[PDB]
Amino acid sequence: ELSGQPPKFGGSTGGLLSKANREEKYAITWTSASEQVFEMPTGGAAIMNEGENLLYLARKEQCLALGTQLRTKFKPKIQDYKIYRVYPSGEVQYLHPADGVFPEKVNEGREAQGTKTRRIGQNPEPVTIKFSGKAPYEV
Amino acid sequence: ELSGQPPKFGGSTGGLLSKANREEKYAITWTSASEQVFEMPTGGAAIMNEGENLLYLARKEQCLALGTQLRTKFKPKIQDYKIYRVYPSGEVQYLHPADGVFPEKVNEGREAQGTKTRRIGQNPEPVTIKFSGKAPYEV
Amino acid sequence: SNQVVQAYNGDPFVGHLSTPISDSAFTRTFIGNLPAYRKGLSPILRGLEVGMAHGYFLIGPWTLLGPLRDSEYQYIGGLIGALALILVATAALSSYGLVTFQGEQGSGDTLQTADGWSQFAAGFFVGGMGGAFVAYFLLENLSVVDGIFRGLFN
Amino acid sequence: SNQVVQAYNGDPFVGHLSTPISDSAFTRTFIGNLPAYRKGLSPILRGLEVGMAHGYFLIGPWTLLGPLRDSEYQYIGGLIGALALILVATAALSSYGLVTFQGEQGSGDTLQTADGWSQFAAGFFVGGMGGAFVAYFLLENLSVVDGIFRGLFN
Amino acid sequence: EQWIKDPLNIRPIAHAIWDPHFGEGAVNAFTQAGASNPVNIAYSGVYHWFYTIGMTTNQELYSGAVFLLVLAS
Amino acid sequence: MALSDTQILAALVVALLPAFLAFRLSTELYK
Amino acid sequence: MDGSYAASYLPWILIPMVGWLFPAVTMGLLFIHIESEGEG
Amino acid sequence: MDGSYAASYLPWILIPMVGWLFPAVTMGLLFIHIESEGEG
Amino acid sequence: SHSVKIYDTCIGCTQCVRACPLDVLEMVPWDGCKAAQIASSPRTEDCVGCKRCETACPTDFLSIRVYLGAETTRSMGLAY
Ligand code: CLA
Ligand code: CLA
Ligand code: CLA
Ligand code: CLA
Ligand code: CLA
Ligand code: CLA
Ligand code: CLA
Ligand code: CLA
Ligand code: CLA
Ligand SMILES: CC1=C(/C=C/C(C)=C/C=C/C(C)=C/C=C/C=C(C)/C=C/C=C(C)/C=C/C2=C(C)CCCC2(C)C)C(C)(C)CCC1
Ligand code: SF4
Ligand SMILES: [Ca+2]
Ligand SMILES: [Ca+2]
């Protein structure tokens, strides 16, 4: 299961809506050396506990903005946060960083997806692929 | 289970109400040497069978008044009646006489409950036990 | 034998008697086919039939004996009294249902649940004010009903 | 402590706040005992109570401000406007219920099923036109209601 | 104020009656002490107490009633 | 002179305030 | 019944409100409360 | 229709009772009875 | 339920137990009196509060005392 103490927060109107219990929510866990104040991505300030911290947010982008704040706005840089997607059935899917290494650094075992062996200007004409249901960049 | 023939009775309005099938009823069983007429505690006369007799009543006091009549108003004194409490779940709890001996006679193995090691006049003052929730006789 | 007074449902120790008033065949087939006891009825239909009968008859006492009986608005006053009494009765029925079926719901009578008693109270409301207005509409155009029954228009 | 503003149901990350407007004891005991939320209610009773209140108050705006307000048929025009608005509202309620509960039916609220919402819409219809007609019948014989409240007939 | 003008032959008035049970006879009988509506005649000494303390107008009584409302608040 | 209709309605609007305060006090005394 | 005093429609509306609506509402709420099998 | 005889309101009430209420009630009870799948 | 207490002036005459119509009291062995028995009340949940046992008690300022307390269906003697 997901472990960590929730950061102490007074509550806000910017948090979870019915999409969290209906479709999906997201979780971010991080270890903290001390007790200091961070900015909620839903507006306001929260206090993160010493040790493990588990925060529930509405979008993946909110978790990643929090992770960017953790890496960039703290003098001991918190570089070990994990972002998960949580489904209402209870299944937790690990998202970020997917291979244990931040994606700006290369890692072996990463497969090239979305890569094109042609240049941007050598995509074929749309008139060559009419009534096929596929765009010039998908062929 | 509870065994015995029901005493033959024409029926009366004084018998069981919805408390019998809702909360509890009571049963009295007794062995009879002959067929003779007794007085119902709910008004009227019934005839008790030869052998085992099982009667259902509303209150424990009605069963015990019947048992007092059985011990005192018959020339062969019926001294072997058992009074039970019957729950609508079906569980039958034996009540009287609890240890097999009538309570006016002493029996070993009976524990003294409700007994006070002080006299009636040496109960403490109520003012000594204010805001405690307990009466002078409960301490 | 010839004795018409027996034990109620064969148990002489239940406090009731099988009498020609309480347990005759007419009594069972009449009471058990009243809307409150009729088998297979949805509780809204039970309440509807009960309300129609009750609201229809409750028009009468204030219509003939109320304080407006000697005015030109006699049927009006009878109707307003019947409607207000049906409103109080419906409020009492719904409050009884809210109080009585707080806890667990039985698997027996659908009427004796919170859901069923609320359905019954809704039916009782609709029937009560319907019966009150249909009896008022008969009484306010009583001249037309009289002419219909005497063939005066035809 | 003394802070009356708390997290909503003890979760500070759900986007709501426990406020004296949102989560006071009066708020819970009032909103949760409104017919739409009252525990144990059949959905037809919920719809009936909601419709009675709504149809009763919807008489007023066209009665006092509509285009027939300066004619001899002012209460008539108010009633026809209220009845037509209740008809449109019932059609909207039933179409919402048909759209929303197409698929699987939940095991929670009986109201939030196709069956329950159809029951609620039926109750809303019956209550809306009942409340509209009872407010019209009070307004059209307002002289009688005034004489009743002043004891003029008695 | 009518009792202020003649506090020896005018009956003080406690409050007005609004009872829909009244008939015409009781309406005429309780239309007393110069009123145009059915009223009760006060017997608590209330008019004499507010005359002895210098109050002479209904507006002062209304202002004091609003004052006791906010004091109770 | 007699009071006005607006005076009476303003007094009732004022009386709404001790009504709410009495509700608050009775609710607080209940617990 | 009538009144020469200001806002004479107010007894007309408030005598049934204090005589019927307020006590029926109060006894209904109190009857629901005193039979509540909530916790004890 | 009218009558000079005593209690002329009685045909007024009883002709619809014997023509409508009694036969509708009788055929309703008989229709419920003759389709009763009780025992046989 | 009502409370039935037995104090140490009990002389074991068993009259309170015989007088009790709801089988509240028994007699247990004892040593404080010549009869060597003291009354006991194990079944006070069946006590109705009739105080027949108090009426039967011969010790001056009775050795058995019934105190009416919490009221139940059994204690109010209800057949319904
Ligand atoms: C305080 C006691 C009291 C008083 C004063 C009244 C007073 C009244 N009752 Mg009433 N009633 C009472 C107690 C009382 N009731 C009780 C305890 C019951 C039993 C629950 C009833 C049941 C009852 C019924 C069932 C009816 C009355 C009716 C009446 C009115 C008849 C007088 C009149 O104008 O004739 C006017 C008479 C008529 C308009 C009758 C016309 C014929 C009707 C429609 C029946 C025809 C039968 C026919 C088959 C229907 C066809 C439909 C379908 C089945 C085919 C009058 C206002 C009648 C009424 O209110 O009519 C609106 C009526 O039908 N009473
Ligand atoms: C502002 C909220 C509100 C409004 C407009 C209504 C309106 C209505 N309710 Mg209602 N009710 C409410 C809140 C409300 N209720 C709450 C919170 C409860 C839970 C206790 C109830 C419980 C309740 C019951 C049990 C019943 C109604 C019924 C009714 C209708 C009859 C008219 C009436 O009661 O007088 C107009 C009402 C008001 C001006 C204010 C009412 C607000 C208080 C809280 C209601 C108190 C409950 C009380 C027992 C019901 C009143 C009975 C009535 C004779 C006075 C009417 C549409 C009856 C009905 O026909 O429903 C289908 C009925 O059987 N209500
Ligand atoms: C555009 C805004 C607007 C307008 C113009 C109106 C206009 C009107 N409203 Mg209305 N109203 C509005 C918005 C509006 N409303 C809103 C937003 C609400 C809240 C949801 C209400 C709620 C409301 C209620 C609850 C009532 C009105 C009433 C009225 C009418 C009063 C004028 C009149 O002739 O007195 C005539 C006055 C009466 C006939 C009142 C007589 C006394 C009644 C019956 C209450 C008595 C209480 C008593 C306890 C009931 C006994 C039954 C039982 C509980 C024992 C008038 C047509 C009244 C009405 O339509 O009466 C039919 C009425 O009772 N309004
Ligand atoms: C010939 C068929 C027929 C007839 C006579 C009716 C008649 C009626 N419908 Mg209806 N309906 C129909 C088919 C029909 N419907 C179909 C096929 C649907 C499925 C889409 C619906 C869905 C529907 C809803 C969701 C509701 C009604 C309602 C009503 C009643 C209000 C009056 C009305 O709608 O205007 C008279 C109607 C006609 C002259 C023709 C209607 C035929 C079309 C197909 C209906 C279109 C659906 C539309 C959303 C509902 C109309 C709303 C209205 C304001 C115009 C009325 C008895 C309302 C009601 O009170 O029900 C209890 C309501 O809530 N209807
Ligand atoms: C059928 C008998 C009857 C009835 C019902 C009434 C009814 C009424 N009369 Mg009345 N009257 C009658 C016969 C009757 N009269 C007769 C025969 C006479 C002689 C001619 C009079 C002479 C008379 C006068 C002179 C006056 C009235 C007034 C009144 C009204 C008082 C209403 C009020 O202030 O609030 C409702 C009632 C009370 C607040 C009284 C409270 C008493 C109860 C027992 C308190 C209960 C509290 C308790 C804790 C319960 C819980 C609370 C509850 C909400 C749950 C009311 C409409 C007065 C009026 O017009 O009002 C302005 C007035 O001044 N009447
Ligand atoms: C506690 C003092 C008190 C008493 C005994 C009365 C008594 C009366 N008032 Mg009244 N009133 C009072 C205070 C009081 N008033 C105040 C302070 C105001 C606001 C300025 C009003 C405004 C008022 C109006 C507008 C009307 C009455 C009317 C009436 C009569 C009928 C009842 C009614 O409809 O009340 C209605 C009362 C209100 C809507 C206002 C609420 C009253 C106060 C604020 C609540 C007091 C609660 C109490 C102290 C709590 C303890 C009660 C106790 C049982 C535990 C009756 C003689 C009616 C009348 O004149 O009939 C002829 C009427 O139309 N009163
Ligand atoms: C103190 C308050 C009070 C008041 C103001 C009244 C007032 C009245 N009583 Mg009454 N009464 C009372 C207490 C009271 N009573 C008590 C305490 C008792 C004895 C214990 C009685 C016993 C009594 C009897 C025995 C009778 C009356 C009757 C009457 C009415 C005579 C006129 C009439 O026909 O009304 C007709 C009007 C109504 C009955 C109520 C009208 C209410 C509205 C207009 C209808 C509903 C409107 C709507 C659906 C709800 C609005 C919702 C929202 C806006 C609130 C009159 C309105 C007579 C009666 O009821 O005649 C029918 C009658 O026979 N009284
Ligand atoms: C069997 C003989 C018989 C016949 C053929 C009729 C025929 C008629 N009666 Mg009549 N009547 C009879 C006996 C009979 N009556 C008796 C014994 C009494 C009591 C003294 C009455 C009292 C009576 C009244 C008060 C009225 C009529 C009226 C009428 C006419 C319309 C029907 C109606 O409303 O009945 C209503 C009849 C009753 C309410 C009384 C019940 C009739 C008897 C007791 C039942 C007989 C049942 C039968 C023998 C069983 C076998 C039937 C067969 C099909 C198997 C009709 C001409 C009405 C009239 O005059 O219209 C102009 C009318 O108002 N009758
Ligand atoms: C022998 C009994 C009998 C009687 C008394 C009547 C009487 C009548 N028939 Mg008729 N008819 C009969 C047998 C009878 N028919 C048979 C055997 C046939 C052919 C097989 C016909 C075929 C026939 C046709 C084709 C027509 C009539 C019509 C009429 C009515 C003409 C006036 C009118 O408009 O009524 C209006 C009144 C009613 C239809 C019934 C009124 C009943 C009350 C007032 C309404 C309900 C009240 C309430 C909700 C229920 C009360 C409950 C409780 C008290 C019982 C008249 C009342 C005409 C008609 O129905 O016009 C509308 C018509 O077109 N008749
Ligand atoms: C101020 C206030 C409030 C509000 C309230 C309200 C808003 C009210 C309203 C009221 C209303 C809104 C009322 C209503 C009522 C209604 C009714 C009462 C109805 C009735 C109906 C009827 C009666 C019907 C019937 C019928 C039918 C069904 C059919 C046949 C015929 C008839 C039509 C009769 C609150 C509490 C929140 C808070 C505090 C303050
Ligand atoms: S009070 Fe009555 S029931 Fe209780 S112990 Fe004494 S005699 Fe028995
Ligand atoms: Ca116009
Ligand atoms: Ca009159």
Swiss-Prot record, chains A, B:
Entry keyword annotation includes Ubl conjugation: no
Keywords, comma-separated and alphabetical: Photosynthesis, Photosystem I
Gene Ontology terms: cellular component: photosystem I; photosystem I reaction center; plasma membrane
Oligomeric and partner information: PS I from Synechocystis PCC 6803 contains seven different polypeptides. The polypeptide corresponding to subunit II from higher plants is missing.
Keyword Transcription regulation: no
Biological source species: Synechocystis sp. (strain ATCC 27184 / PCC 6803 / Kazusa)
Family: Belongs to the PsaD family.
Annotated region (Disordered), positions in chain: 109-139
Top-level taxon: Bacteria
Alphabetical GO biological process terms: photosynthesis
Purpose of the protein: PsaD can form complexes with ferredoxin and ferredoxin-oxidoreductase in photosystem I (PS I) reaction center.
Signal peptide region: none
SUPFAM superfamilies assigned: Photosystem I subunit PsaD
Coiled-coil annotated spans: none
Protein name: Photosystem I reaction center subunit II
From Swiss-Prot, chains C, D:
NCBIfam families cross-referenced by the UniProt entry: PRK00704.1-3
Lineage: Bacteria, Bacillati, Cyanobacteriota, Cyanophyceae, Synechococcales
Membrane topology reported for the UniProt record: Multi-pass membrane protein
GO terms under cellular component: photosystem I; photosystem I reaction center; plasma membrane; plasma membrane-derived thylakoid membrane
Entry annotated with the keyword Cell division: no
Protein's UniProt name: Photosystem I reaction center subunit XI
Gene field: psaL
Family affiliation: Belongs to the PsaL family.
A single GO BP: photosynthesis
From Swiss-Prot, chains G, H:
Membrane topology per record: Single-pass membrane protein
Subcellular location: Cellular thylakoid membrane
Family matches, as Pfam families: PSI_8 (PF00796)
InterPro entries listed in its UniProt record: PSI_PsaI (IPR001302), PSI_PsaI_sf (IPR036357)
Domain of life: Bacteria
GO cellular component: photosystem I; plasma membrane-derived thylakoid membrane
Annotated keywords: Membrane, Photosynthesis, Photosystem I, Thylakoid, Transmembrane, Transmembrane helix
Family membership noted in the UniProt record: Belongs to the PsaI family.
Name of the protein in its database record: Photosystem I reaction center subunit VIII
Annotated organism of origin: Synechocystis sp. (strain ATCC 27184 / PCC 6803 / Kazusa)
UniProtKB/Swiss-Prot annotation, chain I:
Ranges for domain 4Fe-4S ferredoxin-type: 1-30, 38-67
Subunit structure and binding partners: The cyanobacterial PSI reaction center is composed of one copy each of PsaA,B,C,D,E,F,I,J,K,L,M and X, and forms trimeric complexes.
Effect of substituting residue 50 to D/S: Considerably decreases amount of functional PSI, grows mixotrophically only under very low light
Subcellular location: Cellular thylakoid membrane
Residues annotated as binding [4Fe-4S] cluster 1: 10, 13, 16, 57
Protein's job: Apoprotein for the two 4Fe-4S centers FA and FB of photosystem I (PSI); essential for photochemical activity. FB is the terminal electron acceptor of PSI, donating electrons to ferredoxin. The C-terminus interacts with PsaA/B/D and helps assemble the protein into the PSI complex. Required for binding of PsaD and PsaE to PSI. PSI is a plastocyanin/cytochrome c6-ferredoxin oxidoreductase, converting photonic excitation into a charge separation, which transfers an electron from the donor P700 chlorophyll pair to the spectroscopically characterized acceptors A0, A1, FX, FA and FB in turn.
Catalytic activity reported: reduced [plastocyanin] + hnu + oxidized [2Fe-2S]-[ferredoxin] = oxidized [plastocyanin] + reduced [2Fe-2S]-[ferredoxin]
UniProt-recorded name of the protein: Photosystem I iron-sulfur center
Gene from which this protein is expressed: psaC
Primary localisation category: membrane
InterPro entries: 4Fe4S_Fe-S-bd, 4Fe4S_Fe_S_CS, PSI_iron-sulfur_center, PSI_PsaC
Effect the entry attributes to changing residue 50 to D: No detectable PsaC, D or E
Domain of life: Bacteria
Enzyme Commission numbers on file: 1.97.1.12
Membrane topology: Peripheral membrane protein
Organism expressing this protein natively: Synechocystis sp. (strain ATCC 27184 / PCC 6803 / Kazusa)
Keyword field contains Thylakoid: yes
UniProt enzyme class: oxidoreductase
